[PDB]
CSV table of C-alpha atoms in Angstrom, one decimal:
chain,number,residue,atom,x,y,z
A,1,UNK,CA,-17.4,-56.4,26.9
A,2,UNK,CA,-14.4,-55.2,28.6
A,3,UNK,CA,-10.4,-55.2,29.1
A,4,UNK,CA,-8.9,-53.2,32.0
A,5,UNK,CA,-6.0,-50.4,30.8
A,6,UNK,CA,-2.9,-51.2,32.3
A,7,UNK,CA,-1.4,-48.0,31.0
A,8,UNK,CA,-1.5,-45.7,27.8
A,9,UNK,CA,1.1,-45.1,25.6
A,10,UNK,CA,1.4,-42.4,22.9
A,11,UNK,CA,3.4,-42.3,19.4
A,12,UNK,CA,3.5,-39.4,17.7
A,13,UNK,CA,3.4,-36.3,20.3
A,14,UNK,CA,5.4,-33.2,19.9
A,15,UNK,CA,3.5,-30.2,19.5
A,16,UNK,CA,0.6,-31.4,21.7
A,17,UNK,CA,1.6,-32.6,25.2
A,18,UNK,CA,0.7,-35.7,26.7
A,19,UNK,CA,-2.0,-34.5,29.5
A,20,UNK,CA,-4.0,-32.6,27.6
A,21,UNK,CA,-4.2,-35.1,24.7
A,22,UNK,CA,-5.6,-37.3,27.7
A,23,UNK,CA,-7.6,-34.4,28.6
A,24,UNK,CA,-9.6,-34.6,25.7
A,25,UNK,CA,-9.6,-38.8,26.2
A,26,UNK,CA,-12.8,-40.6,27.3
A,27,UNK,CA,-10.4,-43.3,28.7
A,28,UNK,CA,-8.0,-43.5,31.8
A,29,UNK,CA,-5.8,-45.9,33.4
A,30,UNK,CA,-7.9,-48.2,34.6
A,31,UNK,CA,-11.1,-47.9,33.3
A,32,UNK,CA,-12.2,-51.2,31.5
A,33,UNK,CA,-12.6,-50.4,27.7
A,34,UNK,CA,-14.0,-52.2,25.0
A,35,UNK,CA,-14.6,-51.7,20.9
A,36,UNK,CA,-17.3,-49.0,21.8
A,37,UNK,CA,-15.0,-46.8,24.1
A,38,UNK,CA,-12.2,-47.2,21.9
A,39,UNK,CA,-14.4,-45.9,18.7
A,40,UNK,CA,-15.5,-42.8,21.1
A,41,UNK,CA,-11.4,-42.3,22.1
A,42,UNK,CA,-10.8,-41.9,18.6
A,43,UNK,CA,-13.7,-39.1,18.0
A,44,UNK,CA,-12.5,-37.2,20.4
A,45,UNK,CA,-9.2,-37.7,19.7
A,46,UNK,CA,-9.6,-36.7,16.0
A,47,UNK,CA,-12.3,-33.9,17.7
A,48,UNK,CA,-9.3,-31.7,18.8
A,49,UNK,CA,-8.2,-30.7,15.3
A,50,UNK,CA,-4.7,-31.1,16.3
A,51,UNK,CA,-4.5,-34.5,13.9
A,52,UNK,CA,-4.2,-35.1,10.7
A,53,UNK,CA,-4.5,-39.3,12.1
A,54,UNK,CA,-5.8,-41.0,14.9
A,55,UNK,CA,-4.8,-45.0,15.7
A,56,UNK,CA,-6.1,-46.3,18.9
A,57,UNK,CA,-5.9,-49.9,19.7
A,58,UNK,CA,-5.3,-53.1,22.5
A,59,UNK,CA,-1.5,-53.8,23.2
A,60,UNK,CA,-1.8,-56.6,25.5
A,61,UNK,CA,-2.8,-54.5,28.7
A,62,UNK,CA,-1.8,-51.2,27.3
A,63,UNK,CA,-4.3,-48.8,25.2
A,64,UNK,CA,-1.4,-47.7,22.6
A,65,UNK,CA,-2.6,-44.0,21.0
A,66,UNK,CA,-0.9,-43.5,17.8
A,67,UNK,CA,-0.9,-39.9,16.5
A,68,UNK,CA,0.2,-38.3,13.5
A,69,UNK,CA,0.0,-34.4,14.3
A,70,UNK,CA,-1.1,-31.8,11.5
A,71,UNK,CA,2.0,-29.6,10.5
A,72,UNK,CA,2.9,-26.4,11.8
A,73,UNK,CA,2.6,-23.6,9.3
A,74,UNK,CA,6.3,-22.0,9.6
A,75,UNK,CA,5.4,-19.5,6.8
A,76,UNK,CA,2.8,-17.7,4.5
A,77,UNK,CA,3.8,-16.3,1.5
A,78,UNK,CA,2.1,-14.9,-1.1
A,79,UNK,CA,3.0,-14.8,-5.0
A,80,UNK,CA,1.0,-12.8,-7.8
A,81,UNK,CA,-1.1,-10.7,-6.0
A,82,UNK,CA,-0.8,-7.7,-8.0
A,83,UNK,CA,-4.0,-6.2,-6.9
A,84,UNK,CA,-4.6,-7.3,-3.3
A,85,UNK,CA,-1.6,-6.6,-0.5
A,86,UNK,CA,0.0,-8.9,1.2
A,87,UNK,CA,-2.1,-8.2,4.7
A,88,UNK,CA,-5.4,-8.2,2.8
A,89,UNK,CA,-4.3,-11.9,2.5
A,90,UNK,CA,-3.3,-12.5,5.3
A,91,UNK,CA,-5.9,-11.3,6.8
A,92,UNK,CA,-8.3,-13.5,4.9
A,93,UNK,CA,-6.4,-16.5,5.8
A,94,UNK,CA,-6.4,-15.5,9.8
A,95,UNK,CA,-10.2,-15.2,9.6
A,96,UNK,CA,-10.4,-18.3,8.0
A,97,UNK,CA,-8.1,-19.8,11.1
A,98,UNK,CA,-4.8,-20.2,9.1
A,99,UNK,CA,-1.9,-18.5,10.0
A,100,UNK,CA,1.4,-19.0,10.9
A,101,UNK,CA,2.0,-20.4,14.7
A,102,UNK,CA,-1.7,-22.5,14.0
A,103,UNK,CA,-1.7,-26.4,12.2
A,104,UNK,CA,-2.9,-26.6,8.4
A,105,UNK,CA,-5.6,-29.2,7.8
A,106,UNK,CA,-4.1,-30.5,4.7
A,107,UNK,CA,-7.6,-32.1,3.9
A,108,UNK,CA,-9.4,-28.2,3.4
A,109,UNK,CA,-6.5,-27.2,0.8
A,110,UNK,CA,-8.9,-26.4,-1.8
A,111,UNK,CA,-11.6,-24.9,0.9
A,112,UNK,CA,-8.3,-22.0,1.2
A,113,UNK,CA,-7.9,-21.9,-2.7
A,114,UNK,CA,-11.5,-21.5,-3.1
A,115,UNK,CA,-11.4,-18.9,-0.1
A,116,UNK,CA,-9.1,-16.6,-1.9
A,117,UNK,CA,-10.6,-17.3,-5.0
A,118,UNK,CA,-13.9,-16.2,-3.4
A,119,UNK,CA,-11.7,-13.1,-1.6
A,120,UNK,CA,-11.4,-11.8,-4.8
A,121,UNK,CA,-14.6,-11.2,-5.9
A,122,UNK,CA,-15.0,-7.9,-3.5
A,123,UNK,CA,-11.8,-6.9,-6.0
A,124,UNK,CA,-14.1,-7.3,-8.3
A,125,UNK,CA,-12.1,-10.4,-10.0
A,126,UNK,CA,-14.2,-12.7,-10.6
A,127,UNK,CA,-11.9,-15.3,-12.6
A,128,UNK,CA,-8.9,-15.4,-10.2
A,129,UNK,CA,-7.2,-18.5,-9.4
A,130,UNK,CA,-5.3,-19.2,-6.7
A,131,UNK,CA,-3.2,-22.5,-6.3
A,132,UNK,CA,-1.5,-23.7,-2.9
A,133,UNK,CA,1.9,-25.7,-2.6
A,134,UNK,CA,2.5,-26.8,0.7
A,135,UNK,CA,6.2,-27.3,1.3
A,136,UNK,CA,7.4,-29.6,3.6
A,137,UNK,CA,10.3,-28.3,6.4
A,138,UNK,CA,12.3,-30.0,9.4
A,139,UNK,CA,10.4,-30.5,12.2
A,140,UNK,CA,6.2,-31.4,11.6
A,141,UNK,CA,6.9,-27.6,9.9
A,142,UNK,CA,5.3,-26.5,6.5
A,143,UNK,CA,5.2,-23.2,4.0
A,144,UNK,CA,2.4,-22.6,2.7
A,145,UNK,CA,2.7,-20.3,-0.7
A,146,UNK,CA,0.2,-19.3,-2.7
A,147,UNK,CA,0.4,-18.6,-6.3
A,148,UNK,CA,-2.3,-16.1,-7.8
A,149,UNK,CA,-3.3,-15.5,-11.1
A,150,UNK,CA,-5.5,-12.8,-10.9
A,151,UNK,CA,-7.9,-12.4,-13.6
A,152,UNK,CA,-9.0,-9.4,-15.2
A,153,UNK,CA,-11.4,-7.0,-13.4
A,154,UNK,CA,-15.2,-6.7,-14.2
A,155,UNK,CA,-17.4,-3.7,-14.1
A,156,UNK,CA,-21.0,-4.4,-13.7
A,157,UNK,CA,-23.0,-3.9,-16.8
A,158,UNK,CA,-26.4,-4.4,-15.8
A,159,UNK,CA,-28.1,-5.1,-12.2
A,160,UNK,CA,-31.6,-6.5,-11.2
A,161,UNK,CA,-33.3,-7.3,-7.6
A,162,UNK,CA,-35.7,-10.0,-7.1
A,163,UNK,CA,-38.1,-10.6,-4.2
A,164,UNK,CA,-38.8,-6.4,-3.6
A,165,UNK,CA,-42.0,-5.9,-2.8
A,166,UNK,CA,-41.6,-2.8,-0.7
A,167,UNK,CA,-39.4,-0.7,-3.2
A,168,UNK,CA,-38.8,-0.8,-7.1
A,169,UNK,CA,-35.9,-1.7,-8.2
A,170,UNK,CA,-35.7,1.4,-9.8
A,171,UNK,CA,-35.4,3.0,-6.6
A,172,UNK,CA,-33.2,0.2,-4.8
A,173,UNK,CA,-30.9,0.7,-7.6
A,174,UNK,CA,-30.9,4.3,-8.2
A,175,UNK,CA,-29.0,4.2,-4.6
A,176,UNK,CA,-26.2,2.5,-5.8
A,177,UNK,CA,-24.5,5.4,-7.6
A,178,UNK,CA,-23.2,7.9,-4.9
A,179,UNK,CA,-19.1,2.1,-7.2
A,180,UNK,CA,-19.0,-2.0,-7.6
A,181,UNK,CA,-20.7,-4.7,-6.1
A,182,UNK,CA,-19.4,-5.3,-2.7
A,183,UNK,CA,-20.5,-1.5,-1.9
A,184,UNK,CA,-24.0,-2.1,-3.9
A,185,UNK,CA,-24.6,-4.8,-1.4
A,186,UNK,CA,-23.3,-2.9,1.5
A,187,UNK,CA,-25.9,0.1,0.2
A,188,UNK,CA,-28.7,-2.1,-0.5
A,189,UNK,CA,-28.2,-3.7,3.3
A,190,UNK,CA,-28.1,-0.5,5.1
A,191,UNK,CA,-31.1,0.7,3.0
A,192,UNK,CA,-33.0,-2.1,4.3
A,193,UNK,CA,-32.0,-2.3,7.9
A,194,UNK,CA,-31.8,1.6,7.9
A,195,UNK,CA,-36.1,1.1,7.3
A,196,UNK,CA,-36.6,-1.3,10.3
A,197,UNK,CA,-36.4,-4.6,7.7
A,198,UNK,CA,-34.6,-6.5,10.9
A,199,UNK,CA,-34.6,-9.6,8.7
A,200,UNK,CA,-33.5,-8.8,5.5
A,201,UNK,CA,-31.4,-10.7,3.9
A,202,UNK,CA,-29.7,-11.3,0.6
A,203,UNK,CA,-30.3,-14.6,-0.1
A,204,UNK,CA,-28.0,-15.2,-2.8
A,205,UNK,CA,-26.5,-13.3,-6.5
A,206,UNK,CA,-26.1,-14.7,-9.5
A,207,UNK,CA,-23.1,-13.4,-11.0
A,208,UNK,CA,-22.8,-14.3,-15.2
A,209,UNK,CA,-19.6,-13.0,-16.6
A,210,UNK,CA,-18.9,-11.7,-20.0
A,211,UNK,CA,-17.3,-14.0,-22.3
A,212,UNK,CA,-14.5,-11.7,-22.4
A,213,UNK,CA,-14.6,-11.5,-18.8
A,214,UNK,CA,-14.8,-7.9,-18.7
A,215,UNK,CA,-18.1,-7.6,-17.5
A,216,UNK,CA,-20.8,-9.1,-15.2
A,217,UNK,CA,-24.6,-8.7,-14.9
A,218,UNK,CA,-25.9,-9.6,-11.9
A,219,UNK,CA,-29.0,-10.4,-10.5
A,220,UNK,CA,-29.5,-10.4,-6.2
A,221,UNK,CA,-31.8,-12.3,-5.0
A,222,UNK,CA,-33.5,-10.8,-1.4
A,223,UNK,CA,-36.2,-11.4,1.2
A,224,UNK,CA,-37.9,-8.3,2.9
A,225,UNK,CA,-38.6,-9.1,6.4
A,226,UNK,CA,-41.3,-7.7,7.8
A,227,UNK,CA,-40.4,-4.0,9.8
A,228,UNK,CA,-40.0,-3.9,13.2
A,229,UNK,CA,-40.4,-1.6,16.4
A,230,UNK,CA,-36.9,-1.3,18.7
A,231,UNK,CA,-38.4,-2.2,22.1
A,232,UNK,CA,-35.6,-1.5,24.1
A,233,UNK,CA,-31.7,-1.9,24.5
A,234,UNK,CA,-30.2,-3.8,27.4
A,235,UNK,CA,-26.6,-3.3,27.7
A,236,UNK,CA,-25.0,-5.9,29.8
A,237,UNK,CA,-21.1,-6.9,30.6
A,238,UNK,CA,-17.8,-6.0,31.6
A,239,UNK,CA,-18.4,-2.4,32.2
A,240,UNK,CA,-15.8,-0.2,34.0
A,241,UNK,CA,-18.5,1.7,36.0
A,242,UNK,CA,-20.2,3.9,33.5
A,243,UNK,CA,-23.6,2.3,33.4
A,244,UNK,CA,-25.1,5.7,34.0
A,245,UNK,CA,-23.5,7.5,31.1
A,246,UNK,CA,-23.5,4.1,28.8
A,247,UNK,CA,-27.2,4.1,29.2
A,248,UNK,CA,-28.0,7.8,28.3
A,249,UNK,CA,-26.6,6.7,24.9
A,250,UNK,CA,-28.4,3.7,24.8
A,251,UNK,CA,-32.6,4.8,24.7
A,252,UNK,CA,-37.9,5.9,21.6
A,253,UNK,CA,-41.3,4.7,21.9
A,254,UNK,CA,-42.7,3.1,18.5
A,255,UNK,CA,-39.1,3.9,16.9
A,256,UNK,CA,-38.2,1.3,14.7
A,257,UNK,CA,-35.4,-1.0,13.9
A,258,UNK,CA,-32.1,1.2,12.3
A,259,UNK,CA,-29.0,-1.0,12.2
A,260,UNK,CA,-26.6,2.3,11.4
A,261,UNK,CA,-28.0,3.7,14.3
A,262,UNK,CA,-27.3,0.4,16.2
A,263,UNK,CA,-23.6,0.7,14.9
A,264,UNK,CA,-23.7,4.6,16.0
A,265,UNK,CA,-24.7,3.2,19.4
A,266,UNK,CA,-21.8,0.8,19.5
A,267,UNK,CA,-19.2,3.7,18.2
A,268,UNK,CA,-20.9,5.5,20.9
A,269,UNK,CA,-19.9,3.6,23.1
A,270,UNK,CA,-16.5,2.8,22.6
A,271,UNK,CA,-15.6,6.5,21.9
A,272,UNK,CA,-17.1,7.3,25.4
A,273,UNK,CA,-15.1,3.9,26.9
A,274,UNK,CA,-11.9,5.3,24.8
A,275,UNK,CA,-12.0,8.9,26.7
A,276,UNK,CA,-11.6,7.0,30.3
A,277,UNK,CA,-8.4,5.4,29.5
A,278,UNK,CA,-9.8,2.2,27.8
A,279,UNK,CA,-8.3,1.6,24.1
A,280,UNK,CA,-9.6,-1.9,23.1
A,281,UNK,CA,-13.6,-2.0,24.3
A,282,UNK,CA,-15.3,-4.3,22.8
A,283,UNK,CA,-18.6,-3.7,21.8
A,284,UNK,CA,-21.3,-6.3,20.5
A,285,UNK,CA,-24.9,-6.4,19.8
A,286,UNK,CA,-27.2,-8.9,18.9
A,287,UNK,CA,-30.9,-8.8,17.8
A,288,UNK,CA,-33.6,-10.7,19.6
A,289,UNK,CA,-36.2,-10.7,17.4
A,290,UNK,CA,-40.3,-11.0,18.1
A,291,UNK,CA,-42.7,-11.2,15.6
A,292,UNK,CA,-45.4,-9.1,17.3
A,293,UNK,CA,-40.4,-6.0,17.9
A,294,UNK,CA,-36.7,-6.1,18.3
A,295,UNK,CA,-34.7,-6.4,21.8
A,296,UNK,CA,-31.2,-4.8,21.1
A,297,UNK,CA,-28.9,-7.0,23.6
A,298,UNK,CA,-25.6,-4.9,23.5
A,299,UNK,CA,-22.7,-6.5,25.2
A,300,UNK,CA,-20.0,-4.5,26.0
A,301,UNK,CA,-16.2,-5.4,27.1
A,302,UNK,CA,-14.0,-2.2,28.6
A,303,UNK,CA,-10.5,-4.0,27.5
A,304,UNK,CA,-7.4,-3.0,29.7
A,305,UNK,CA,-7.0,-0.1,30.9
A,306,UNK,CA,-2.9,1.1,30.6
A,307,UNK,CA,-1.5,3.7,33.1
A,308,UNK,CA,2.3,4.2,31.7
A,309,UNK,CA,4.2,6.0,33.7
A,310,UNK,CA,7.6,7.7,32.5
């Protein structure tokens, strides 16, 4: 149908400011708006991430956009992790996007317990739990602690592969030792991609604990690709002017697929970039797989370059 916006009024702003909360509006002043736009307002509203509520409605002539912002996280603290440090933590939690300075979605609280919970498997706890308490503070501020109880550590106690076809488990394993599961996986993935298996992939593992809780068999579950031929490798991106050198470190003819190579390329790369005055290069590659070869698409960013002068 229709009704003409007269104006728009906000309740509810503070951390976000005013135009770009319109920016992310499908509506202006004046546009003529009706249940369907308002429905969309709110989507995009609620889109932004920077709300924890969204209330948009008529007001005679006025569209009135009522907001209730998430809260700022004013701290992170961390209580009973004995084993894991502090950064480790919080380093988890910035990968995950929370962090201090950022808004906490108070609706993914137990997505962040589970998180850590899940963090601590590499420790090779697998019976941790981790509890959040949000606290509320003066402004639209919050702390965020969490409490660990770490559980007792396991050591593997028996291990089995399935979906091999191009090694025995036997030989997969016997790899392992050179030691808990995190770095099994890492070996097992490198042994793989090391052979040219450009799309193999761990599919899943089955962890079942010891009633005590001491110990864990597991069971991983794979998928060998097929192998594959390295047909080339384009490097491409904010060079500095180095292409010529780059290149000599990026070219074989039927050579196949490495993945450790690959990284030695990227290292390569950076170490060469680090010698010309550039510290924070940032090097990525990405796989462009054919069933028939692999295209290594290496994109490369020289960072700044600093020229202190005393």
């Amino acid at each position: 149908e229709g009704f003409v916006v007269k104006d728009i009024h906000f309740e509810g702003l503070q951390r976000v400011a005013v135009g770009a909360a319109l920016l992310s509006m499908p509506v202006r002043t004046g546009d003529t708006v009706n249940d369907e736009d308002i429905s969309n307002t709110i989507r995009a509203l609620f889109a932004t991430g920077n709300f924890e509520d969204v209330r948009v409605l008529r007001d005679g002539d006025t569209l009135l956009v009522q907001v209730k912002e998430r809260p700022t996280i004013a701290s992170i603290t961390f209580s009973g992790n004995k084993s894991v440090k502090d950064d480790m933590l919080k380093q988890n939690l910035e990968a995950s996007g929370v962090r201090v300075g950022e808004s906490l979605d108070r609706t993914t609280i137990a997505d962040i317990e589970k998180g850590l919970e899940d963090f601590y498997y590499s420790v090779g706890k697998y019976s941790a739990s981790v509890k959040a308490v949000v606290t509320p503070l003066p402004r639209n501020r919050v702390d965020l602690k969490l409490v660990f109880q770490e559980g007792v550590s396991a050591e593997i106690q028996q291990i089995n592969i399935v979906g091999n076809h191009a090694f025995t488990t036997d030989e997969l394993i016997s790899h392992f030792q050179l030691q808990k599961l995190a770095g099994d996986l890492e070996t097992l993935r490198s042994y793989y991609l090391d052979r040219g298996y450009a799309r193999f992939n761990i599919d899943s593992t089955q962890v079942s604990l010891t009633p005590d809780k001491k110990g864990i068999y597991v069971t991983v579950n794979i998928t060998e690709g097929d192998q594959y031929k390295l047909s080339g490798v384009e490097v491409s991106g904010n060079l500095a002017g180095h292409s010529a050198e780059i290149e000599q470190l990026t070219k074989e003819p039927g050579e196949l697929y490495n993945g450790t190579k690959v990284t030695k390329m990227e290292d390569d790369i950076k170490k060469l970039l680090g010698r010309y005055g550039y510290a924070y290069p940032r090097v990525q590659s990405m796989p462009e797989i054919n069933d028939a070869t692999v295209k290594l698409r290496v994109n490369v960013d020289a960072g700044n370059r600093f020229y202190v002068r005393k």
